């Protein structure tokens, strides 16, 4: 109920028990604080709105799905879909003060995977990592959640400009069903007035800036089944945030990387955080965009024929500027600025 916080974190790997474990980064900073994990969310009076972007040097998520600081935004992936290597391109190519990981996952070989890639980061001295391994109990599963979360608040009470990573709601979810059950409810019998199926929209909640404080910008991945269907964890938390990235396992397959799906993504906060040019070549890129899909299903139905269609003609010779837009090395980040250059350029 209560867990380790503050700087000395920094460069630590931490496990269900708010132990630290291992070190990816040694930093100056020896502070060693404690708050409760089951802290309040802010009250309405003390949330600001979103109005200032969260830049992520991603082209496409940049130019077509800005994000906000305080935003929590939701990946929906399924395996094989690079959902961790965007995550890395998020922190690595972002600009927050202080970045916090809560890996919920199952096999010991994904958390060093992320180990290693945190050894070699060049945010590695502002990030912290909390895990929880398939070993461990349902409960320490869903806490690893809760101390990501407490860490992240304590960062943001101190005025940081804070990003938080949950991989997965779907294994946190999974898991607070299990603890549920040792409570003695289900999805479909719930206690009253507590319910252990309520940790989740109140640990959904807990993200956003704050009047007097900081910001945590949030993403959630949620792990998808078979031809990306989204099962009801899946629809609920597609509600409750505010924005979501779909990252497609048939972009995947063709070899587009970062696998965004751009017109089955949104961020809600769009036309708050950028401006008008910005609002404007992000519209006309995005009708590029649904006429390239247009052309493709008339060349899959073998009804393309060049010289027939000066329009469709056109199209298809935006398709390969389309697509080296779209694409990005994972080592690359993009300023702003080199963002809207490029997709201007794309749309001429």
Not at 4 to 16: D, T, Y
Not at 95 to 110: C, K, N, Q, S
Not at 114 to 125: A, F, G, R
């Amino acid at each position: 109920l209560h867990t380790q916080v503050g700087r000395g974190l920094l460069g630590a790997v931490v496990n269900p028990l708010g132990e630290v474990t291992d070190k990816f980064a040694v930093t100056d900073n020896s502070e060693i604080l404690y708050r409760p994990v089951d802290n309040a969310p802010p009250l309405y009076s003390e949330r600001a709105a979103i109005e200032k972007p969260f830049l992520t040097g991603i082209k496409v998520i940049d130019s077509l799905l800005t994000c906000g600081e305080g935003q929590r935004m939701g990946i929906f992936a399924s395996a094989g879909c690079g959902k961790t290597f965007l995550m890395n391109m998020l922190i690595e190519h972002s600009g927050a003060d202080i970045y916090v990981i809560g890996l919920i996952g199952e096999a010991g070989a994904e958390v060093t995977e992320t180990v290693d890639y945190l050894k070699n980061s060049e945010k590695k001295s502002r990030c912290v990592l909390v895990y929880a391994t398939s070993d461990y109990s349902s409960v320490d599963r869903c806490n690893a959640a809760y101390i990501a979360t407490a860490i992240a608040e304590f960062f943001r009470t101190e005025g940081h400009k804070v990003a938080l990573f949950i991989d997965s709601l779907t294994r946190y979810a999974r898991a607070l069903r299990d603890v549920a059950l040792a409570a003695g409810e289900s999805p479909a019998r719930r206690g009253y007035p507590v319910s252990v199926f309520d940790s989740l929209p109140r640990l959904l909640e807990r993200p956003g800036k704050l009047k007097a404080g900081g910001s945590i910008t949030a993403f959630y991945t949620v792990l998808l089944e078979d031809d990306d269907f989204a099962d009801p964890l899946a629809e609920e938390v597609r509600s409750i945030l505010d924005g979501h990235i779909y990252l497609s396992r048939n972009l995947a397959q063709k070899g587009q990387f970062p696998a965004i799906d751009s017109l089955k993504s949104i961020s809600r906060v769009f036309t708050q955080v950028v401006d008008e040019k910005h609002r404007i070549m992000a519209a006309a890129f995005r009708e590029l965009l649904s006429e390239i899909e247009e052309l493709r299903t008339i060349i899959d139905f073998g009804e393309y024929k060049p010289g027939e269609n000066a329009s469709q003609d056109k199209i298809y010779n935006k398709i390969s500027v389309v697509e080296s837009f779209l694409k990005q090395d994972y080592r690359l980040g993009f300023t702003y600025e080199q963002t809207m250059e490029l997709i201007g350029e794309t749309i001429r």
